[PDB]
Amino acid sequence: ELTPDQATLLHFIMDSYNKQRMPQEITNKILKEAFSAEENFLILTEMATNHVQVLVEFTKKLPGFQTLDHEDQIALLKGSAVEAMFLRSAEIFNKKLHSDLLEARIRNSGISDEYITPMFSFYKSIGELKMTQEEYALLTAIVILSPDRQYIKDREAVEKLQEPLLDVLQKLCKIHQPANPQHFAKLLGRLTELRTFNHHHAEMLMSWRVNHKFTPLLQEIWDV
């Protein structure tokens, strides 16, 4: 039982989310270039800073995000970008159609083996959920509008913007999957798992830093 308001809120988010387009001269670099660790780190940097450009140009389109504290709305992206990059990469790695090449480049880009194992454990775990593109898009928007983010002053104001998305996603889990009432519970469990990755991601950067060169935009979100 979805409403026409939710249906039009889902429609906006989806077409806001399907507008993501990996530029051709980056996506073809994955195969055409060599797999040296420095070259792997170079490509991964470009994809990261590009998806951040994608991410801001999908977040500002979120209904009501612009109507918030300038300092707090900035804080949302600071704490949601890593989790939204994990969620977008998890979708591409479990999509059925080059995923295998990028994985090899991530594994051979200078990351400590302490962070590889949880990363692909998460990717595998997300894959078993068999999420639709609607669930990936709503989950990304839910992840951004989080009330319990750090350095947040108006926590109650964010609640008003998140609750409807959770309301929409919860209906979809009950509508499209009645043969499994834990699908919604397992969906929300991934946001919990993303927090772990978000917080021990700066250590992954640290190892990458004590060795390289980040873009100013990437330095501007991850505090480098």
């Binding site: 801001v56 612009q66 900035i74 935009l217």
Partner: peptide
């Protein structure tokens, strides 16, 4: 955090 505010509120 200049570029994020700059990349925000754009036509």
């Amino acid at each position: 955090h200049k570029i994020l505010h700059r990349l925000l509120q754009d036509s």
